[PDB]
Amino acid sequence: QCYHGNGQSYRGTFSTTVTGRTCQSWSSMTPHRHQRTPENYPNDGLTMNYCRNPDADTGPWCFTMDPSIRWEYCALTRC
């Protein structure tokens, strides 16, 4: 599955990182405490634990459910 451009506007349901880790939900502070929440960023599609690029990175990403890995890019290709 692919994303367009830098993935900022990707709104798909992929939730797996490039190392096979599972994305943390954006609204959750567990395991990673963060500020990129749908409450703060209501228009970036920060739904469940779906891969997103709300901060002008270069591809969709997420905080990971591994407490030792803050975040990773998602295992998506560029369209």
Ligand SMILES: O=C(O)CCC1CCNCC1
């Ligand atoms: O630690 C955080 O809150 C975010 C770290 C990076 C998330 C991926 N894009 C660059 C910043």
